[PDB]
Amino acid sequence: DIIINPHAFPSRMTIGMFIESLAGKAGACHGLAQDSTPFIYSEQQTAADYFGEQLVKAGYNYHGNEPMYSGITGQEMKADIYIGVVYYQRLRHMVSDFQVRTTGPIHNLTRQPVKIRFGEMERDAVIGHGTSFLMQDRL
Amino acid sequence: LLRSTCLYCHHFKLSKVKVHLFFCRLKLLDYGLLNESEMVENVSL
Amino acid sequence: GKAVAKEDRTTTPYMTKYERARILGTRALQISMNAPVLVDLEGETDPLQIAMKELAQKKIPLLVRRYLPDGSYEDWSVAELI
Amino acid sequence: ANMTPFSDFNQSPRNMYQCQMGKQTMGTPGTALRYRTDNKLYRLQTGQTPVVRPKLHNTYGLDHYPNGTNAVVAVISYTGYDMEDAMILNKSAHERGF
Amino acid sequence: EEKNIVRVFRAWKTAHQLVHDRGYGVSQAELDLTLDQFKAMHCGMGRNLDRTTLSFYAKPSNDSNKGTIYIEFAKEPSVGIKEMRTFVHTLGDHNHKTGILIYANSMTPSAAKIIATVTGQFTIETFQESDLIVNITHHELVPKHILLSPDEKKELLDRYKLRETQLPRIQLADPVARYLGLKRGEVVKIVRRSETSGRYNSYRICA
Amino acid sequence: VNYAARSVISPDPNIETNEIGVPPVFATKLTYPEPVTLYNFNEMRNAV
Amino acid sequence: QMTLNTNVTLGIPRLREIIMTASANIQTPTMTLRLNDGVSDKRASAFCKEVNKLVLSEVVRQVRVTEKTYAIRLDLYSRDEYQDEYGVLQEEIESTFSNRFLKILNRIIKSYLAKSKQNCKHLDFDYVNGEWATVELVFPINTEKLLMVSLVEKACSETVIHEIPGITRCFSKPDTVPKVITEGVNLKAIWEFYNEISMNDIYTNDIAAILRIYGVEAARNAIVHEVSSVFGVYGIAVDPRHLSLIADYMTFEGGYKAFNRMGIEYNTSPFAKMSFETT
Amino acid sequence: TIRMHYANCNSYNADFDGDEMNMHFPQSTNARSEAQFIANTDSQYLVPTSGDPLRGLIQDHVVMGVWLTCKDTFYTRDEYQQLLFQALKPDETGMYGRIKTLPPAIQRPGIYWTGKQIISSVLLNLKPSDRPGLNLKSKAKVPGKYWSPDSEEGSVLFDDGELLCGILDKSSFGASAFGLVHSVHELYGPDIAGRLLSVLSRLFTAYAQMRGFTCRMDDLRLDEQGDNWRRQLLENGKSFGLEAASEYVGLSTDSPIALLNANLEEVYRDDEKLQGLDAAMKGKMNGLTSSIINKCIPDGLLTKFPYNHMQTMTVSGAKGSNVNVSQISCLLGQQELEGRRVPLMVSGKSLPSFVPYETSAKSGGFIASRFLTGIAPQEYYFHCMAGREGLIDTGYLQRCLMKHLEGLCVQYDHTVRDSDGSIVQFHYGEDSLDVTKQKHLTQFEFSAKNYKSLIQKYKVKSVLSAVDSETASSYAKKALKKPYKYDPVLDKYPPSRYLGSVSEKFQRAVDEYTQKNPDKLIA
Amino acid sequence: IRPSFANRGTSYSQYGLSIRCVRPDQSSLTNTLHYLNNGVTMFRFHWRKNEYLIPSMMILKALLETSDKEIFEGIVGKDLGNTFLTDRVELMLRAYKSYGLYSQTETLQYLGSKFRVVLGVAEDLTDVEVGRFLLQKVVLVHLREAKDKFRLLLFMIRKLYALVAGECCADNPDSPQHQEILLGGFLYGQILKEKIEDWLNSIRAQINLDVRRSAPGVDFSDRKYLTRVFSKINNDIGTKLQYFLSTGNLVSNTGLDLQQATGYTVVAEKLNFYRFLSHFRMVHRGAFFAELKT
Amino acid sequence: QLTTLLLHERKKVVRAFYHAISSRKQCDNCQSFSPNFRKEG
Numbered sequence A: 001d002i003i004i005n006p007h008a009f010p011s012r013m014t015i016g017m018f019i020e021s022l023a024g025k026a027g028a029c030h031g032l033a034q035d036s037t038p039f040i041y042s043e044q045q046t047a048a049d050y051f052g053e054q055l056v057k058a059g060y061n062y063h064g065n066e067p068m069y070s071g072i073t074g075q076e077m078k079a080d081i082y083i084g085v086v087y088y089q090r091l092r093h094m095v096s097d098f099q100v101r102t103t104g105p106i107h108n109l110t111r112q113p114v115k116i117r118f119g120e121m122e123r124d125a126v127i128g129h130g131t132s133f134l135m136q137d138r139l
Numbered sequence B: 001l002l003r004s005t006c007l008y009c010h011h012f013k014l015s016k017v018k019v020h021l022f023f024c025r026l027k028l029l030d031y032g033l034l035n036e037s038e039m040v041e042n043v044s045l
Numbered sequence C: 001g002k003a004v005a006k007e008d009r010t011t012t013p014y015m016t017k018y019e020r021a022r023i024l025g026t027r028a029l030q031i032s033m034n035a036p037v038l039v040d041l042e043g044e045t046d047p048l049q050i051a052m053k054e055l056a057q058k059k060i061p062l063l064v065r066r067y068l069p070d071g072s073y074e075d076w077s078v079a080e081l082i
Numbered sequence D: 001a002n003m004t005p006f007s008d009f010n011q012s013p014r015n016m017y018q019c020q021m022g023k024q025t026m027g028t029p030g031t032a033l034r035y036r037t038d039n040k041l042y043r044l045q046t047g048q049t050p051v052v053r054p055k056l057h058n059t060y061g062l063d064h065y066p067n068g069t070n071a072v073v074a075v076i077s078y079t080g081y082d083m084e085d086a087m088i089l090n091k092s093a094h095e096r097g098f
Numbered sequence E: 001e002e003k004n005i006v007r008v009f010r011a012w013k014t015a016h017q018l019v020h021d022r023g024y025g026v027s028q029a030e031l032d033l034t035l036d037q038f039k040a041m042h043c044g045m046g047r048n049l050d051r052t053t054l055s056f057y058a059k060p061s062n063d064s065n066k067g068t069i070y071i072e073f074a075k076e077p078s079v080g081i082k083e084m085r086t087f088v089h090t091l092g093d094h095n096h097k098t099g100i101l102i103y104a105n106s107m108t109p110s111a112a113k114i115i116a117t118v119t120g121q122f123t124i125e126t127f128q129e130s131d132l133i134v135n136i137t138h139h140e141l142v143p144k145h146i147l148l149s150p151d152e153k154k155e156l157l158d159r160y161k162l163r164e165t166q167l168p169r170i171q172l173a174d175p176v177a178r179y180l181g182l183k184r185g186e187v188v189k190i191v192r193r194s195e196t197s198g199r200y201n202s203y204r205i206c207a
Numbered sequence F: 001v002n003y004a005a006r007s008v009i010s011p012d013p014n015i016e017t018n019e020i021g022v023p024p025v026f027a028t029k030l031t032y033p034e035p036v037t038l039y040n041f042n043e044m045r046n047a048v
Numbered sequence G: 001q002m003t004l005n006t007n008v009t010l011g012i013p014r015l016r017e018i019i020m021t022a023s024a025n026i027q028t029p030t031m032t033l034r035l036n037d038g039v040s041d042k043r044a045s046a047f048c049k050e051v052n053k054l055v056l057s058e059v060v061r062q063v064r065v066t067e068k069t070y071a072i073r074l075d076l077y078s079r080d081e082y083q084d085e086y087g088v089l090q091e092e093i094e095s096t097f098s099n100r101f102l103k104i105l106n107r108i109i110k111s112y113l114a115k116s117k118q119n120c121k122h123l124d125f126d127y128v129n130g131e132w133a134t135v136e137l138v139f140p141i142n143t144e145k146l147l148m149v150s151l152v153e154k155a156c157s158e159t160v161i162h163e164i165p166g167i168t169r170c171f172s173k174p175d176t177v178p179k180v181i182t183e184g185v186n187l188k189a190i191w192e193f194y195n196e197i198s199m200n201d202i203y204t205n206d207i208a209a210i211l212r213i214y215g216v217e218a219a220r221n222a223i224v225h226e227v228s229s230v231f232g233v234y235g236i237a238v239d240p241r242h243l244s245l246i247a248d249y250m251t252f253e254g255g256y257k258a259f260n261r262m263g264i265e266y267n268t269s270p271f272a273k274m275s276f277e278t279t
Numbered sequence H: 001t002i003r004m005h006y007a008n009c010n011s012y013n014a015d016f017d018g019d020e021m022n023m024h025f026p027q028s029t030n031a032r033s034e035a036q037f038i039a040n041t042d043s044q045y046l047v048p049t050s051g052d053p054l055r056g057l058i059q060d061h062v063v064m065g066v067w068l069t070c071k072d073t074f075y076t077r078d079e080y081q082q083l084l085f086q087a088l089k090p091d092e093t094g095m096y097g098r099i100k101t102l103p104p105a106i107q108r109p110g111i112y113w114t115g116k117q118i119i120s121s122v123l124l125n126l127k128p129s130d131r132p133g134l135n136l137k138s139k140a141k142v143p144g145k146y147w148s149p150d151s152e153e154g155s156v157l158f159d160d161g162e163l164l165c166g167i168l169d170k171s172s173f174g175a176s177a178f179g180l181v182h183s184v185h186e187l188y189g190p191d192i193a194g195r196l197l198s199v200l201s202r203l204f205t206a207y208a209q210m211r212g213f214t215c216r217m218d219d220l221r222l223d224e225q226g227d228n229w230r231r232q233l234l235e236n237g238k239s240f241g242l243e244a245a246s247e248y249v250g251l252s253t254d255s256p257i258a259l260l261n262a263n264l265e266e267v268y269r270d271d272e273k274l275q276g277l278d279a280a281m282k283g284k285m286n287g288l289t290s291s292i293i294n295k296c297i298p299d300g301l302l303t304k305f306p307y308n309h310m311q312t313m314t315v316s317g318a319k320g321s322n323v324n325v326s327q328i329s330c331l332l333g334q335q336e337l338e339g340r341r342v343p344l345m346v347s348g349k350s351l352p353s354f355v356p357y358e359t360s361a362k363s364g365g366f367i368a369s370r371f372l373t374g375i376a377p378q379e380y381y382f383h384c385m386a387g388r389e390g391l392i393d394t395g396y397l398q399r400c401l402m403k404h405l406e407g408l409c410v411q412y413d414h415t416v417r418d419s420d421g422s423i424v425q426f427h428y429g430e431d432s433l434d435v436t437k438q439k440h441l442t443q444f445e446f447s448a449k450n451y452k453s454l455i456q457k458y459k460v461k462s463v464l465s466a467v468d469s470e471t472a473s474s475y476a477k478k479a480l481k482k483p484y485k486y487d488p489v490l491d492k493y494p495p496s497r498y499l500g501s502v503s504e505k506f507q508r509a510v511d512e513y514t515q516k517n518p519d520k521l522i523a
Numbered sequence I: 001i002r003p004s005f006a007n008r009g010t011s012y013s014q015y016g017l018s019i020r021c022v023r024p025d026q027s028s029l030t031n032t033l034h035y036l037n038n039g040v041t042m043f044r045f046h047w048r049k050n051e052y053l054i055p056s057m058m059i060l061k062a063l064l065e066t067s068d069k070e071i072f073e074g075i076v077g078k079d080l081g082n083t084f085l086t087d088r089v090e091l092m093l094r095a096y097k098s099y100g101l102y103s104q105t106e107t108l109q110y111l112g113s114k115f116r117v118v119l120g121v122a123e124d125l126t127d128v129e130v131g132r133f134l135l136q137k138v139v140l141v142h143l144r145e146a147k148d149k150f151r152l153l154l155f156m157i158r159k160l161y162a163l164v165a166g167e168c169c170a171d172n173p174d175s176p177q178h179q180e181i182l183l184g185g186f187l188y189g190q191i192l193k194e195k196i197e198d199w200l201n202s203i204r205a206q207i208n209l210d211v212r213r214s215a216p217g218v219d220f221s222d223r224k225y226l227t228r229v230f231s232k233i234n235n236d237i238g239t240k241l242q243y244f245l246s247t248g249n250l251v252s253n254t255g256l257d258l259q260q261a262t263g264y265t266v267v268a269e270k271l272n273f274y275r276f277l278s279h280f281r282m283v284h285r286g287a288f289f290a291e292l293k294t
Numbered sequence J: 001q002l003t004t005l006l007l008h009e010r011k012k013v014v015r016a017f018y019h020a021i022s023s024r025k026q027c028d029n030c031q032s033f034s035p036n037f038r039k040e041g
């Protein structure tokens, strides 16, 4: 249902997410509500090995991998791929998304576009590139 | 500039030779003469 | 002011990264305002890439005046630059 | 913060971001919405209980206020659009009501 | 204890060196003075016995420039008013154009304006010991500074269409400025050894 | 400034290293003047 | 790009001081002097303690003061352990203790007495063994009690044996190139010692000092190297061309100019001047 | 939602996570001409601060690069043609008529093109009209020992435009100079480097779609010998904390507990003695940490370099570092919060779980458990301390150095003046250029290697015409006469027209190369 | 150990002892002990937004009928003649002997004649009871019995002197060891009591002005007069509390010992369940610390 | 037969001038004492 990128897990350390995907694909199969309280699973027997016993009882691969065929070519991917059941809560920060200004009102005094911002750092960039005419145009 | 005015003198409180010195300085700085601006002072009376 | 003579010119014979852009820009504007194209078109439409076709063959007017810091200036034909 | 499954496996800045970001989910703000005079509410049509959960997610009565669904996530770099932390969303898995 | 005797020795390879470095000429033996060489040259009963004889001179190697130079060590601390003006007519009568002095310590400022006017076509200049005792120019952070004649200064002002006020400046209080004997208006050419690409020549003036 | 849009970006690997994809909405909402000559007259007639 | 570290100030405060305010009195003015051939580690540490400054508090033990007369007795460490970390002699202590210590002690007592308003009667140093120091004082009885413990601690902590003005904490750090890294900046002092070479001396900028007594070009190369080293502690590279241009513009007028009201007040265009800070 | 490619993500410093971008339109034609030629994106391949390039591919493309150029790869005809055409995609770009290929690397018993041949093929299709092929030798990011003992891959060598040996990774194409893409930028001009960067992008994406790449679980788990090695090293260093503390304070390891406790109580009422104690104990713990890392991560963990899908993303340089697989697999090590270590409360116990004046390093913020297995509470608290410390750790100096340096432009007599007319430098910073056009001067081996494309890039027959060649070249040698009275050639002769005049150190270096290692230059 | 003490009272020093004492109605105010370089200790406190500084020996003698041997043998009665404590207490005793008087009645009368102005005490009744009003209302409000305020003051001054000599570590105010939480309803009760006290002071000023004019209506026996005066003044304090809740600007004549006076109320955004809970659990130290970047 | 350094010297010289003219209380030409004037904000 959702393709996530593998390059996001190193330098982020969300190994908790790998364990959670393991536990999801394990719990959904048998029908358990996989217990995931902090600080239960010790160093003797790891949580990964527990959910792996779960999965190999269910039938899937013990490391969580799963043999996938690609859709755009049809023949199998050489390397197995990691599929689990994660819990994705949709965010809401996108409520304030966009404004295109071809022409519109002008200012009372200075005849400027009424209140996008180009200047005092944009001017640095443009006279950095050596673009006199672009500065004198846009400004 | 009022503080430095001399109401009875109608000039500056300064000595007129110092005001003339600074006038010569600001004359000679006009045309771009720096060390020449500073050389005016090598006179002793 | 002085217009430095053609015998002695001290500026760089290279078409600087800036003179190329502005020459092409002003030539594109000129051609956009119904000016004469000095080179056969092959069907290109943009009133700028025609100026690129002109500059590729060095068939362009508009000598440039390079303003030295004295106040003097050189007159370089765009055929003359490298 | 306690309701983050295997919260002792992540680099603790990740648990900090997860707390401060699960406080901002488009989730069910209750059950009496017909009688609310708030300005902006957000509600999630299809929520479920997590399949991986801490027991306190049952004790604290979260079952009455779900936050998200269960996505069948495949860790894979295949589409190519999913770099710089982005991701995809299986189209029919969207048009069936994700 | 008696370390004052090496201080005044080191004030010679900062003065007998402060000649070219200017364009003058000095025998290569007064640059190679050993430690005890100075003692054997200027000795006495002491073991203090250095003063009353610390005075030398030098003539230009350009064979012109009106005229020569004379260095002297005023050992009496805080030279003041009765030790400066009396040591001017000597430079005048030897036809010595410009001279040098020392003082340790605290040259009295009252003895600084009434003598700086008597110089006129001459210039008393300028130094004190315990402040310039080892050549600063012998160093990594100070490039080789060179003076320039008005012909070579005209050449500069011509190749660059400049005015004599558009160049960089060097204040007269700059150590190397009074070291080289700069006058307000002379163009120095400095040989930057900046190692990003080669060693190049910048120019500076005084004002 | 006039003629300056502003939007959220999202990544695409198919286009180019130069190019930027703009939806047809920015196609329709950002315009620039162009004189009409003999050989781009067809483009501009068709555009109007 | 980066500001977080992983003692001298590094990061944007350093750059802010070197290139924005062009301040004298930098927070950590250090110098670095290269040793020579003719010097051994014994002479290295000897010169180190020599140019270093110590405070009479740093050799005194607990100081007891008996009340009545009015009597103060300082305990001084054994000359052996006192000469391991030091090498100031007993006679030096005697002289400077007597003179300057009595001066400081009487000065601070007069300070507190004048504050409360709203002489050194006998002195006995351990003239042979040097492990104690007695000062017997007499006061009028109408004067209120004195916190002699705190006052004597303030005196012994404020009085100095041998200080070169504005230098302290000369230290030795290891390329088989023995060097001395000193806090504070007094070139005028370091001219004097001939154990270490007077040419190859690195300076944390203090570019006021080096501009003042090594030229203008010295200031230029110093500031180039300084900003290079400030950006060198991070894995960010700024080629010497940018630094060369910024430096050689900064030391243009002949000194070294900050990029503030001083430098803003000199431009020839009256619109930028009107623009940037205060119209 | 507007779409832009990944290459620019490094330049704009964007993350595609919600930050939005102003998109202007230059109206007049002069403005769009100058935007197209001067400030267009493909010409922004070099940052101004240093020469090191900033554009270049990212995570997925570079891991798939390590996996495509690897030598155990093989393609049939179908995959070769298809992957190539996905890479090129001529019609959307244009300028080329028909796609041309190579012969196959192996021919019997089945015909198979190899991966390096696909990279060579892309380079062959993007070669300009007449420029001899690329040839180059440069170290790669994936170290040579990871492939084999005395492995050959190591360092990419490729002559006349065919990838002869070595694999491409973050150093080859990306934010790393002197690789493939930067040398294409030098030889074949910028607008070809841009096409090549795009072509590599699509080629690696299409290969991903053929094969795919994923960071599964077993990539992390230590094989039983590995984790028992880790267990043995931790049982060995069970007591390093006490050893280091007792050595610091002066006592022996067998001292009475009460005296050690009294001395410790005397120690960290102060602050400097804490600095010393934490420094010593930190040295001890970091010795232990480096030991178990060095013994475990290269060989302990389950799958070796090529197949381990996190060893690839880590040591190839896509995303992450060696400390990351260290933490996910072996141990976390000391928790250094603002320098020293965990702050001791009033009663001297690091945390209410530990007895007072506790010495064992587990109380000093050294936590042995790894993220894969799970960290315990007392350890998790110190980890929260360090992380939140970071978070509380994570614009006026652009109106100081910019108001005074407004103009500061390089006038035509080649003397960088302020715009009021006054000089600031002659020969701007020892002219050659700010980093953009000065990167490859130090690369004398590369320029002399091919040399047939650089003469056509400089257009010798048009440059040698109108510029002076003999005068400055002659006077240069005389300036290389050590005695003075011959200034630098740049000062006497301007460098724009007198084609012999060049900085002194450049002459010194080119001559020391020509005399020292001319193995390319014949006699 | 806070360095801002130093430049505060220049005879002062950084070492101080702070105590936030609270009445039975959870209406605390502070009163700190400044240890000044001279040796005595000042009893800083707050009243009507204004600092106030009376020497600690003054109120120590004013509190109980005490003789100086008791103060001494209470502060340092131990290990007879411990050097530091013994000389510091001697210096303190004499520095107070400087200007003050002997008995408790004289000290209370001086204290009243000094502080009758700022206390809202009855204008006409008496003068020594105003001293008792201070030593009841400000000095140490959590304690009721005078002798016990005296004992705790001796203990506290002993703690200060121990802290000065380095025999006591500095407790850390920025740590939950020395922190408590103020709930909602207790702050509500404090503000309600403050509004009631303002209401009483307001009808009192209205009665005083009614009497002061010449004598328009003065019948302190007639209930009609009280109906008149109640009808005169603003009798609506519901809107004051409702304003505190609507805005947050705690507008009170005395801050009730609260550093910041803005930002007391958060709007319970029910956007998501966790958001609602996280509103209910959180705490905060106040932006008076946010403005200091450390 | 303007530049920064010229302006950098002019501004300093005029600052010195205005330090000077505000110093004298007695006239040197009139020798008298002109009546002072006191200002407000």
Ligand SMILES: [Zn+2]
Residues within 6 Å of the ligand: B006, B007, B008, B009, B010, B011, J027, J029, J030, J031, J032, J034
């Ligand atoms: Zn007058």
